[PDB]
Symmetry: C6
Subunit: 68 residues, 6 copies
């Protein structure tokens, strides 16, 4: 399920970790995860934007992180 | 669920906030959200059009949105 | 849910409005919506072709259209 | 699938020559030999299985009776 | 519903038929169907690699195959 | 057959810690070890553990063959 995606995203959110989100088309977004639900992530940095999960390849934290 | 996506689109809709919508294929659409449902967004501006969510990567508001 | 997509496509259909349908790969199709269901749209012209909704980015009517 | 199935079944049973445009822009030609919910067997020189998720459009070479 | 895909893939597996698998991105994989489930295919050659179906456009056997 | 192949296959690569290559839909090649996975994502370990959406993966390729249970 999301039995893993969620605590991971939530850990990045809670602790305000800088991340790169890579999109399926190769576009790289940077920021902190402000919030998220089942389908979108709200990314904040130089401009705030709502990102669709279905368009995301990877989420890469800038530092190692406690895992579920 | 859609606990985040929906109040976010509704606030954009209600406050007529100009948005940029970036499609998975890199095309940028521009305008205001007239309405939406689970699967599509109705975008009005110089050009009015129905946009399938599955083709959307990000929604970038022209100014930040305060959620309820 | 479908509260917008259905009445929007049904209106375009009943009114025989010429539409531009942009595919996810950038290609543009033009014609009239002959019919549609959950997964496909039948686009009328020289022949009526079947278009999977999953392959569509946007539907753009040639003229402004209301949905009373 | 109230439209897709009778439409593909007409194409199959009348052995109508078709074009299948894929989401990446590749164009396949042949005839529909069989299909189910997820795949179409496209028949020709070499026959092949096409995933509907990779199809953008299905374009018959001639007009065909339309499901009503 | 799966009355084509399963028996097609299973015939290709049982008979160890050389196949080409084309991905939506243009990549051409070659080998033989080792096993498959609802979502992935195990494609044997130098190692058995897991191919996600959603990434596949077509499956093309190296020779014709009689179905059950 | 549901996930009767994908789960044990990924589980094998996880438990045996076999290095894999994960190719993305856009051609990009990621490399590391499968730390864990759920229905939707795979955690890929190297410098940091990045999260890979399955919907963006075309293939997972083990650096060396392995066997299913
Ligand atoms: N974890 C990842 N997921 C998806 N794509 C990635 C990832 N890491 C790198 N890429 C992409 O792979 C390509 C090659 O990576 P490389 O490290 O050479 O790029 P880079 O110079 O670091 O650029 P960037 O800082 O934008 O990643 C780049 O287009 C990059 O954006
Ligand atoms: N927030 C975003 N989400 C997804 N894709 C984006 C985003 N911002 C830019 N891109 C993509 O990155 C590519 C690089 O273009 P760039 O961002 O430099 O132009 P731009 O700053 O958007 O210009 P303008 O603001 O005038 O549109 C664009 O093709 C665009 O599709
Ligand atoms: N409303 C839209 N939705 C999705 N894609 C679009 C839309 N409008 C244009 N495009 C695509 O984006 C690309 C660049 O857009 P641009 O602003 O140049 O439109 P255009 O090329 O003048 O339109 P046309 O191709 O009809 O002349 C075009 O190839 C077109 O296919
Ligand atoms: N029904 C369709 N579905 C998807 N793409 C199409 C369709 N018809 C044409 N195209 C694409 O539109 C582009 C422009 O088509 P144009 O009418 O200029 O040439 P064409 O005669 O359609 O070429 P062809 O049919 O050989 O692809 C081509 O790249 C073609 O692949
Ligand atoms: N299993 C695979 N899944 C998806 N893409 C692949 C795969 N193998 C190769 N590619 C594509 O090939 C390009 C580089 O080729 P690569 O070195 O990965 O071939 P290879 O698989 O090592 O060949 P061989 O199977 O002969 O060892 C990458 O951009 C990648 O997109
Ligand atoms: Na990149
Ligand atoms: Na094309």
């Amino acid at each position: 399920g999301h039995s893993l995606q969620d605590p991971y995203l939530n850990t990045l959110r809670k602790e305000r970790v800088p991340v790169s989100i890579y999109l399926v088309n190769g576009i790289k977004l940077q920021g902190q995860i402000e919030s998220f639900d089942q389908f979108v992530i709200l990314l904040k940095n130089t401009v705030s934007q709502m990102v669709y999960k279905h368009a995301i390849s990877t989420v890469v934290p800038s530092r190692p992180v406690r895992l579920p």
